């Protein structure tokens, strides 16, 4: 529409809107950014390399007083879509990522209300490091965290806030290997820094143990059950060595396979 | 399933007298993260239970 393009040209006019500048008013006031993580898919947990891969939608909300207009002057328009690469953004990234990918994947449009409110819900595929506990494998429970920070602005320039105290599962596809237990979020400060602020989510996930039960535990139990038979085998039959050496070989091979499944950490031994 | 047994079954105490209720489990209920997840609830007649204590060292607001 002619009115819509007039409005979009007016809003993003580089002569009077610089996207490099924080939308700060009242001097030393700070920009408040609301964050909310929605989980769409838990793509995989890789125990060996200790990485979790997720598909998430990262809701980010703030107010930019410079992106305001009067609806009566623009055909009564209440909100418009703007390209997120042409407006100021809080550079909120995943700090504990693996693969060195901090930003979101797509950079969708931002919805902008006439009063300056900005809604931005870009999708992302994230790979995050997490500490894998091997002790109770394959009946283990994992605790993998996702730390979100701004890598441009500190606590004196923006404030990160949680829209909700848990992550959203409204559009979640179940995994089939991992069961979701809890997804709490917390806002952390540093009493000795005063410029540090992050929002962390704890992903508490519980392995469904049937697959590894069937494929590892039962074969292991079956092999172990043979360990006693050597002492009931008569010495005349001439087969004791065959049996005991075969059992030892099978146990060692299973130990090596397990060692190849779990991460090669030394903080604990799987039971 | 873990079994919780509460003693005494009844506790008579006049107003202003300290009360003590003992709660024992079938086995340990400790967790790796360094917390024990035990909780206390009260149910006045005709009303749904209410939360009093969680993570016993803590207290619900």
């Amino acid at each position, epitope marked *: 529409t002619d009115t819509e393009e007039r409005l979009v040209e007016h809003l993003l006019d580089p002569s009077r809107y610089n996207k490099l500048i924080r939308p700060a008013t009242n001097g030393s006031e700070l920009v408040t950014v609301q964050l909310m993580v929605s989980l769409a898919q838990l793509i995989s947990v890789h125990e060996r390399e200790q990485i979790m891969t997720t598909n998430v939608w990262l809701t980010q909300e703030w107010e930019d007083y410079r992106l305001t207009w009067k609806p009566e002057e623009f055909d009564n328009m209440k909100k418009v879509r703007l390209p997120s690469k042409h407006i100021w953004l809080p550079d909120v990234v995943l700090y504990n990522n693996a693969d060195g990918m901090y930003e979101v994947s797509f950079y969708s449009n931002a919805v902008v209300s006439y009063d300056g409110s900005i809604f931005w819900l870009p999708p992302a595929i994230y790979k995050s490091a997490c500490k894998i506990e091997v002790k109770h494998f394959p009946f283990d429970q994992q605790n993998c965290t996702m730390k979100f920070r701004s890598w441009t602005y500190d606590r004196t320039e923006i404030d990160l806030v949680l829209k909700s105290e848990v992550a959203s599962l409204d559009d979640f596809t179940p995994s089939g290997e991992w069961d979701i237990v809890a997804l709490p979020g917390r806002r952390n400060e540093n009493p000795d820094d005063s410029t540090y602020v992050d929002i962390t989510y704890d992903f508490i996930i519980r392995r469904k143990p049937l697959f590894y039960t069937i494929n590892l535990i039962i074969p292991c139990v079956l092999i172990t059950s043979l360990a006693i038979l050597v002492f009931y085998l008569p010495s005349d039959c001439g087969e004791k060595m065959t049996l005991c050496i075969s059992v030892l070989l099978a146990l060692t091979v299973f130990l090596l396979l397990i060692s190849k499944i779990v991460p090669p950490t030394s903080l604990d031994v799987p039971l | 399933d873990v079994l919780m047994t509460q003693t005494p079954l009844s506790l008579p105490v006049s107003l202003g007298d300290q009360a003590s209720i003992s709660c024992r489990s079938s086995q340990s209920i400790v967790h790796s993260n360094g917390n024990t997840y035990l909780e206390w609830y009260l149910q006045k007649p005709g009303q*749904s239970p209410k939360l009093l204590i969680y993570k016993v060292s803590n207290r619900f607001s």
Partner: nanobody
Amino acid sequence: VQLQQSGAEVMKPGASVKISCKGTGYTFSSYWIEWVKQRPGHGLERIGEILPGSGSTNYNEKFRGKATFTADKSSKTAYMQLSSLTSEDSAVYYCARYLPYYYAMDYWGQGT
């Protein structure tokens, strides 16, 4: 936040009943819903739980097969279906919010 439970139900032995719990004012899909049974004599017995966001459910030993949980994400409601009913099943049933290992079950339904 508020959890709203359906009304009272009177059924014949061997019939089937379905109770509902509707949660509002919070992220309904991200909280487990706990179902509790309280026979008129005494005792709070937990039937099980369901996480609306996924389909995951857990049942106690005594209620396996007896109770089935389901959840509707569109209308923020969770349903418990009870199997063939007996006079032993007459009680008051509660629905409550819960997030394991964190802030825990601080809100309950009025009871059915």
